[PDB]
Amino acid sequence: GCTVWLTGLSGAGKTTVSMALEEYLVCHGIPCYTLDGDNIRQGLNKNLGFSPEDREENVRRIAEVAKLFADAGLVCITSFISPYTQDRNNARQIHEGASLPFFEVFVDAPLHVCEQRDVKGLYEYEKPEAPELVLKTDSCDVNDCVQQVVELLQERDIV
Amino acid sequence: RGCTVWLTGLSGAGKTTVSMALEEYLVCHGIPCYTLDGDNIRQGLNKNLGFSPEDREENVRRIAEVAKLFADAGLVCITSFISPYTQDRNNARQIHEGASLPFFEVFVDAPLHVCEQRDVKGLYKKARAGEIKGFTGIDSEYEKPEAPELVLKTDSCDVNDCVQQVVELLQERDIV
Ligand SMILES: Nc1ncnc2c1ncn2[C@@H]1O[C@H](COP(=O)(O)OS(=O)(=O)O)[C@H]2OP(=O)(O)O[C@H]21
Ligand SMILES: Nc1ncnc2c1ncn2[C@H]1C[C@H](O)[C@@H](COP(=O)(O)OP(=O)(O)O)O1
Ligand SMILES: Nc1ncnc2c1ncn2[C@H]1C[C@H](O)[C@@H](COP(=O)(O)OP(=O)(O)O)O1
């Protein structure tokens, strides 16, 4: 189907949006799968460390896996901070060269909100240049954010 | 009902041919599936790997992890790679066992002489001439599976018979 490439600060709402989006798609009979730290970091990317080079390879491998899911006809949602513009652009081009729909989705809450949420007590990021969608997770709720994504997918005939 | 059907065998043994026919059968019977092969893996995810023993180890490790994701997503994932090393195929199986996902090792078994006689891509001739170095079966090893779930004797069974053998295994193991 396509790749829905989430990006945004820690605590902005990527895990939450991806879970609710997958729920909506599954209940509407649309095949979908999420790539996230829980299924990538200790599997495909277990042999990558902290160096810039390895982080670049981390994103490249995630993008190539999302591309296979998209080619297979799934909505593939990636849920990573994805901080660097160059790496997001590389992920985009991996898809665009194969004519696979790619949606860069900026999960956008202010740092202050993310810090106040501190969902995991964890408490630089390059904001998306021209993403296909911005989800303002401080001003609307999870269901409205999901609906914005679904609308985007309908317009491009994925849903 | 996701799972991985892991093909292994010499160049020209019939992996591409079996995977295509099996995918077509499954699609036509309403069973989601997807094939991982050289065409969608070795110039994408694995574009930064060659054919040295260590790069084959990594090729197969990465493919195993991706196949686990597809099986986890509920697809029948068919992998079509020589996968010549026992240790690496066993690791691929362990990755699936670790995630409670069924894994079926299918040995696509044709004698080397048959594969050389088929010489589908002219590679065996080049290998013998030393024009390609490290070609599996000529100048690098193929370790035959000793406990595969299924052996497809592609020199004595036709493609449709081989596909039906795989479908039967999937039925026995409650996948389809
Ligand atoms: N030296 C070497 N040895 C074996 N096959 C090679 C080699 N050079 C290239 N090819 C071509 O690549 C394919 C094997 O790649 P795999 O990813 O299946 O190999 S492994 O699982 O990593 O061992 C073969 O399929 P083909 O189209 O018949 O040509 C062959
Ligand atoms: N519209 C919205 N979308 C997503 N999450 C929201 C939201 N409004 C409030 N939240 C909350 C739910 C979670 O407690 C928190 C986001 O946590 P998360 O999804 O785990 O973040 P991330 O995966 O981006 O690190 O913010
Ligand atoms: N039972 C069988 N299964 C698969 N291929 C068979 C077969 N009987 C004959 N063939 C032929 C079809 C092809 O020309 C050749 C196998 O080529 P292939 O599928 O490209 O091999 P591989 O992908 O293992 O390198 O053998």
Coordinates of C-alpha atoms and ligand atoms in Angstrom, one line a residue:
Chain A
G1 CA 0.0 0.0 0.0
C2 CA 2.0 2.9 1.3
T3 CA 4.4 4.1 4.1
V4 CA 3.2 6.5 6.8
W5 CA 6.5 7.8 8.1
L6 CA 5.9 9.4 11.5
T7 CA 8.5 11.8 12.9
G8 CA 8.5 14.0 16.0
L9 CA 9.9 14.6 19.4
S10 CA 10.0 12.0 22.2
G11 CA 6.5 12.1 23.7
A12 CA 4.8 14.0 20.8
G13 CA 2.4 11.0 20.2
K14 CA 3.9 8.7 17.6
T15 CA 3.3 5.4 19.5
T16 CA -0.2 6.6 20.3
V17 CA -1.1 7.7 16.8
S18 CA 0.4 4.6 15.2
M19 CA -1.6 2.3 17.6
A20 CA -4.9 4.1 17.0
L21 CA -4.2 4.3 13.2
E22 CA -3.5 0.6 12.9
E23 CA -6.6 -0.1 15.0
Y24 CA -8.8 1.9 12.6
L25 CA -7.2 0.3 9.5
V26 CA -7.5 -3.3 10.8
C27 CA -11.2 -2.8 11.8
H28 CA -11.8 -1.5 8.3
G29 CA -10.2 -4.5 6.7
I30 CA -7.1 -2.6 5.5
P31 CA -3.9 -4.6 5.9
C32 CA -1.3 -2.7 7.9
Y33 CA 1.8 -3.2 10.1
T34 CA 3.8 -0.9 12.3
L35 CA 7.6 -0.7 12.5
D36 CA 8.9 0.6 15.8
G37 CA 11.7 0.3 18.3
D38 CA 10.1 -2.8 19.8
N39 CA 10.3 -4.8 16.6
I40 CA 13.4 -3.3 14.9
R41 CA 16.0 -2.5 17.6
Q42 CA 16.7 -6.0 18.8
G43 CA 16.1 -7.7 15.5
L44 CA 17.0 -6.3 12.1
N45 CA 19.0 -3.4 13.7
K46 CA 20.6 -5.2 16.6
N47 CA 24.1 -4.9 15.1
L48 CA 24.0 -1.2 14.8
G49 CA 25.4 1.1 17.5
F50 CA 25.4 4.8 18.5
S51 CA 27.7 6.3 15.7
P52 CA 26.3 8.7 13.2
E53 CA 27.1 6.2 10.5
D54 CA 25.1 3.5 12.3
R55 CA 22.2 5.7 13.0
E56 CA 22.1 6.6 9.2
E57 CA 22.1 2.9 8.4
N58 CA 19.4 2.3 11.0
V59 CA 17.0 4.6 9.2
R60 CA 18.0 3.3 5.8
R61 CA 17.2 -0.3 6.8
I62 CA 13.8 0.8 8.3
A63 CA 13.0 2.6 5.1
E64 CA 13.9 -0.4 3.0
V65 CA 11.7 -2.6 5.1
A66 CA 8.8 -0.2 5.0
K67 CA 9.2 -0.2 1.2
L68 CA 8.7 -4.0 1.1
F69 CA 5.6 -3.7 3.2
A70 CA 4.2 -1.0 0.9
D71 CA 5.1 -3.1 -2.2
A72 CA 3.3 -6.0 -0.5
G73 CA 0.1 -3.9 -0.4
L74 CA 0.2 -3.0 3.4
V75 CA -0.1 0.4 5.0
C76 CA 3.3 0.4 6.8
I77 CA 3.5 2.9 9.7
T78 CA 6.9 3.7 11.1
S79 CA 7.1 5.1 14.6
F80 CA 10.5 6.6 15.2
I81 CA 11.7 10.1 16.2
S82 CA 13.4 10.2 12.9
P83 CA 15.3 13.5 13.8
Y84 CA 17.4 14.3 10.7
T85 CA 16.1 15.8 7.5
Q86 CA 18.7 14.0 5.4
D87 CA 17.6 10.6 6.7
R88 CA 13.9 11.3 6.1
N89 CA 14.6 12.5 2.6
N90 CA 16.6 9.2 2.0
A91 CA 13.6 7.3 3.2
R92 CA 11.3 9.3 0.9
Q93 CA 13.5 8.7 -2.1
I94 CA 13.7 5.0 -1.5
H95 CA 9.9 4.9 -1.9
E96 CA 9.5 7.6 -4.6
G97 CA 11.9 5.9 -6.9
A98 CA 9.6 2.8 -6.9
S99 CA 6.4 4.9 -7.1
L100 CA 5.3 3.8 -3.7
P101 CA 3.2 6.4 -1.8
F102 CA 5.2 7.9 1.1
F103 CA 3.6 10.3 3.6
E104 CA 6.0 12.2 5.9
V105 CA 3.8 12.9 8.9
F106 CA 5.0 15.5 11.5
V107 CA 3.7 14.5 14.9
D108 CA 4.0 18.0 16.3
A109 CA 3.7 18.9 19.9
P110 CA 5.9 21.6 21.5
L111 CA 8.9 20.4 23.5
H112 CA 7.3 21.9 26.6
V113 CA 4.2 19.7 26.2
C114 CA 6.4 16.6 25.5
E115 CA 8.4 17.4 28.7
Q116 CA 5.2 17.9 30.7
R117 CA 3.7 14.6 29.4
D118 CA 7.0 12.8 30.2
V119 CA 5.0 9.6 29.3
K120 CA 8.1 7.6 29.9
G121 CA 10.1 9.6 32.5
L122 CA 12.8 10.1 29.9
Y123 CA 12.8 13.9 30.4
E124 CA 19.0 17.8 17.7
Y125 CA 15.6 17.4 16.1
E126 CA 15.2 19.0 12.6
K127 CA 11.6 19.8 11.9
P128 CA 10.1 18.4 8.8
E129 CA 10.5 20.8 5.9
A130 CA 7.3 20.1 3.9
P131 CA 5.6 17.1 5.3
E132 CA 2.4 15.7 3.7
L133 CA 0.6 16.1 7.1
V134 CA 1.1 17.8 10.4
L135 CA -0.7 16.3 13.4
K136 CA -0.9 19.0 16.1
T137 CA -1.2 16.6 19.0
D138 CA -1.4 19.4 21.6
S139 CA -4.5 20.9 20.0
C140 CA -6.5 17.9 18.9
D141 CA -7.2 14.5 20.2
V142 CA -6.0 11.1 19.1
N143 CA -9.1 10.3 17.2
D144 CA -9.0 13.5 15.2
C145 CA -5.4 13.0 14.4
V146 CA -6.2 9.5 13.1
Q147 CA -9.0 10.9 11.0
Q148 CA -6.6 13.4 9.4
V149 CA -4.3 10.5 8.4
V150 CA -7.3 8.5 7.1
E151 CA -8.5 11.5 5.0
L152 CA -5.0 11.8 3.5
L153 CA -5.0 8.0 2.6
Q154 CA -8.5 8.3 1.1
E155 CA -7.5 11.1 -1.1
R156 CA -4.6 9.0 -2.4
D157 CA -6.8 5.9 -2.8
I158 CA -5.2 3.8 -0.1
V159 CA -8.4 3.8 1.9
Chain B
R1 CA -1.8 -17.4 10.4
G2 CA 1.5 -15.8 9.3
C3 CA 4.5 -18.0 8.7
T4 CA 7.8 -18.2 6.8
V5 CA 8.4 -20.8 4.0
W6 CA 12.3 -20.7 3.8
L7 CA 13.6 -22.0 0.5
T8 CA 17.2 -23.1 0.2
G9 CA 19.1 -24.8 -2.6
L10 CA 21.7 -24.4 -5.3
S11 CA 21.5 -21.8 -8.1
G12 CA 19.1 -23.2 -10.7
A13 CA 17.5 -25.8 -8.4
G14 CA 14.1 -24.1 -8.8
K15 CA 13.7 -21.5 -5.9
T16 CA 12.4 -18.6 -8.1
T17 CA 10.2 -21.0 -10.1
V18 CA 8.7 -22.6 -7.0
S19 CA 8.2 -19.3 -5.1
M20 CA 6.4 -17.7 -8.0
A21 CA 4.1 -20.6 -8.5
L22 CA 3.4 -21.0 -4.8
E23 CA 2.7 -17.2 -4.4
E24 CA 0.3 -17.4 -7.4
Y25 CA -1.5 -20.4 -5.8
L26 CA -1.8 -18.7 -2.4
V27 CA -3.0 -15.4 -3.9
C28 CA -5.6 -17.2 -6.0
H29 CA -6.9 -18.9 -2.9
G30 CA -7.2 -15.7 -0.8
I31 CA -4.1 -16.2 1.3
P32 CA -2.0 -13.1 1.8
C33 CA 1.6 -13.7 0.9
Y34 CA 4.8 -12.0 -0.2
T35 CA 8.1 -13.2 -1.6
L36 CA 11.5 -12.0 -0.5
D37 CA 14.1 -12.7 -3.2
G38 CA 17.3 -11.3 -4.8
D39 CA 15.3 -8.8 -6.9
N40 CA 13.6 -7.0 -4.0
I41 CA 16.3 -7.6 -1.3
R42 CA 19.8 -7.6 -2.8
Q43 CA 19.5 -4.1 -4.3
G44 CA 17.5 -2.6 -1.5
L45 CA 17.9 -3.7 2.1
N46 CA 21.0 -5.7 1.2
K47 CA 22.5 -3.6 -1.4
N48 CA 25.5 -3.1 0.9
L49 CA 26.3 -6.8 1.1
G50 CA 28.2 -9.1 -1.3
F51 CA 28.9 -12.8 -1.4
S52 CA 31.8 -13.4 1.0
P53 CA 30.9 -15.9 3.7
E54 CA 30.4 -13.1 6.3
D55 CA 28.2 -11.1 3.9
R56 CA 26.1 -14.2 3.2
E57 CA 25.7 -14.7 6.9
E58 CA 24.4 -11.1 7.2
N59 CA 22.3 -11.4 4.1
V60 CA 20.4 -14.3 5.6
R61 CA 20.2 -12.7 9.1
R62 CA 18.6 -9.6 7.7
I63 CA 16.2 -11.6 5.5
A64 CA 15.3 -13.8 8.5
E65 CA 14.4 -10.7 10.5
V66 CA 12.3 -9.2 7.7
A67 CA 10.5 -12.5 7.1
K68 CA 9.7 -12.6 10.8
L69 CA 8.1 -9.2 10.5
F70 CA 6.0 -10.3 7.5
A71 CA 4.9 -13.5 9.3
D72 CA 4.1 -11.4 12.4
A73 CA 1.9 -9.2 10.1
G74 CA 0.0 -12.4 9.1
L75 CA 1.4 -13.1 5.7
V76 CA 2.9 -16.3 4.3
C77 CA 6.4 -15.0 3.7
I78 CA 8.3 -17.0 1.1
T79 CA 12.1 -16.5 1.0
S80 CA 14.0 -17.5 -2.1
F81 CA 17.8 -17.5 -1.3
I82 CA 20.5 -20.0 -1.8
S83 CA 21.2 -19.7 2.0
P84 CA 24.1 -22.2 1.8
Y85 CA 25.1 -22.2 5.5
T86 CA 23.4 -24.5 8.1
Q87 CA 24.3 -22.3 11.0
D88 CA 22.6 -19.3 9.4
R89 CA 19.5 -21.2 8.4
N90 CA 19.2 -22.5 11.9
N91 CA 19.6 -19.0 13.3
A92 CA 16.8 -17.9 10.9
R93 CA 14.6 -20.7 12.4
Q94 CA 15.5 -19.6 16.0
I95 CA 14.5 -16.0 15.2
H96 CA 11.0 -17.3 14.3
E97 CA 10.8 -19.8 17.2
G98 CA 11.7 -16.8 19.5
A99 CA 8.6 -15.0 18.3
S100 CA 6.2 -18.1 18.2
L101 CA 6.0 -17.9 14.4
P102 CA 6.0 -21.1 12.3
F103 CA 9.0 -21.6 10.1
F104 CA 9.2 -24.2 7.4
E105 CA 12.6 -25.0 5.9
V106 CA 12.1 -26.3 2.3
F107 CA 15.1 -27.8 0.5
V108 CA 14.7 -27.2 -3.2
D109 CA 16.9 -30.2 -4.1
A110 CA 18.3 -30.8 -7.6
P111 CA 21.6 -32.3 -8.2
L112 CA 24.5 -30.0 -9.1
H113 CA 24.7 -31.7 -12.5
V114 CA 21.1 -30.9 -13.2
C115 CA 21.6 -27.3 -12.1
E116 CA 24.7 -27.0 -14.3
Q117 CA 22.8 -28.6 -17.2
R118 CA 19.9 -26.0 -16.7
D119 CA 22.5 -23.2 -16.4
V120 CA 19.6 -20.8 -16.4
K121 CA 21.8 -17.6 -16.3
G122 CA 25.1 -19.0 -17.8
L123 CA 26.7 -18.7 -14.4
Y124 CA 28.0 -22.2 -14.0
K125 CA 29.9 -22.0 -17.2
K126 CA 31.6 -18.8 -16.1
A127 CA 32.2 -20.3 -12.6
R128 CA 34.0 -23.3 -14.0
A129 CA 36.1 -21.0 -16.3
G130 CA 37.1 -19.1 -13.1
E131 CA 35.4 -16.0 -14.6
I132 CA 33.3 -15.8 -11.5
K133 CA 35.0 -16.7 -8.2
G134 CA 33.2 -18.1 -5.1
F135 CA 30.1 -19.4 -6.9
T136 CA 28.1 -21.8 -4.7
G137 CA 28.5 -25.4 -5.6
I138 CA 31.7 -24.8 -7.7
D139 CA 34.1 -22.6 -5.5
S140 CA 32.1 -22.1 -2.3
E141 CA 30.1 -24.5 -0.2
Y142 CA 26.4 -25.5 -0.1
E143 CA 25.6 -27.2 3.2
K144 CA 22.6 -29.5 2.6
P145 CA 19.8 -29.3 5.2
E146 CA 19.6 -32.4 7.3
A147 CA 16.2 -31.8 9.0
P148 CA 14.2 -29.8 6.6
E149 CA 10.4 -29.8 6.8
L150 CA 10.1 -30.6 3.1
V151 CA 12.4 -31.7 0.3
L152 CA 11.3 -30.8 -3.2
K153 CA 13.0 -33.0 -5.7
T154 CA 12.8 -30.7 -8.6
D155 CA 14.5 -33.1 -11.0
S156 CA 11.8 -35.7 -10.5
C157 CA 8.7 -33.6 -9.7
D158 CA 7.2 -30.9 -11.9
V159 CA 6.5 -27.4 -10.6
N160 CA 2.9 -27.9 -9.9
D161 CA 3.6 -31.1 -7.9
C162 CA 6.2 -29.2 -5.9
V163 CA 3.7 -26.4 -5.2
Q164 CA 1.1 -28.9 -4.1
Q165 CA 3.7 -30.5 -1.7
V166 CA 4.2 -27.1 -0.1
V167 CA 0.5 -26.4 0.1
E168 CA 0.0 -29.8 1.8
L169 CA 2.7 -29.0 4.4
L170 CA 0.9 -25.7 5.1
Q171 CA -2.4 -27.6 5.5
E172 CA -0.9 -30.2 7.8
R173 CA 0.6 -27.4 10.0
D174 CA -2.8 -25.6 10.2
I175 CA -1.7 -22.5 8.1
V176 CA -4.1 -22.9 5.3
Ligands
LIG1 N1 29.3 -16.0 -5.8 C1 28.0 -16.3 -6.0 N2 27.5 -17.5 -5.5 C2 26.2 -17.8 -5.7 N3 25.3 -17.0 -6.3 C3 25.7 -15.8 -6.8 C4 27.1 -15.4 -6.6 N4 27.3 -14.2 -7.2 C5 26.1 -14.1 -7.6 N5 25.1 -14.9 -7.5 C6 23.7 -14.7 -7.9 O1 23.0 -14.3 -6.7 C7 22.0 -15.3 -6.4 C8 22.3 -15.9 -5.0 O2 22.1 -14.9 -4.1 P1 21.5 -15.3 -2.6 O3 21.2 -14.0 -1.9 O4 20.4 -16.3 -2.8 O5 22.8 -16.0 -2.0 S1 23.0 -16.3 -0.5 O6 21.8 -16.7 0.1 O7 23.5 -15.0 0.1 O8 24.1 -17.3 -0.5 C9 22.1 -16.4 -7.3 O9 20.9 -16.6 -8.1 P2 21.1 -16.6 -9.7 O10 20.2 -15.5 -10.2 O11 21.2 -18.0 -10.2 O12 22.6 -16.0 -9.6 C10 23.2 -16.0 -8.3
LIG2 N1 -3.5 13.8 19.8 C1 -2.6 13.1 20.5 N2 -1.9 12.1 19.9 C2 -1.1 11.3 20.5 N3 -0.8 11.3 21.7 C3 -1.5 12.2 22.5 C4 -2.4 13.1 21.9 N4 -2.9 13.9 22.9 C5 -2.3 13.5 24.0 N5 -1.4 12.4 23.8 C6 -0.7 11.8 24.9 C7 -0.9 10.2 24.8 C8 0.5 9.8 25.4 O1 0.3 9.9 26.9 C9 1.5 10.9 25.0 C10 2.2 10.5 23.7 O2 3.1 9.4 24.1 P1 3.7 8.5 22.9 O3 2.6 8.2 21.9 O4 4.3 7.3 23.7 O5 4.9 9.4 22.4 P2 6.1 9.1 21.3 O6 5.8 7.7 20.7 O7 6.0 10.2 20.3 O8 7.3 9.1 22.2 O9 0.7 12.1 24.7
LIG3 N1 10.1 -28.9 -10.2 C1 10.7 -27.7 -10.6 N2 10.7 -26.6 -9.8 C2 11.3 -25.5 -10.2 N3 12.0 -25.4 -11.3 C3 12.0 -26.4 -12.2 C4 11.4 -27.6 -11.9 N4 11.5 -28.5 -13.0 C5 12.2 -27.8 -13.9 N5 12.5 -26.5 -13.5 C6 13.3 -25.5 -14.2 C7 12.7 -24.1 -14.3 C8 13.9 -23.2 -14.4 O1 14.3 -23.1 -15.8 C9 15.0 -23.9 -13.6 C10 15.1 -23.4 -12.2 O2 15.4 -22.1 -12.2 P1 15.2 -21.0 -11.0 O3 13.8 -21.2 -10.5 O4 15.5 -19.6 -11.5 O5 16.3 -21.5 -10.0 P2 16.9 -20.8 -8.6 O6 15.9 -19.6 -8.3 O7 16.9 -21.9 -7.6 O8 18.2 -20.3 -9.0 O9 14.5 -25.3 -13.5

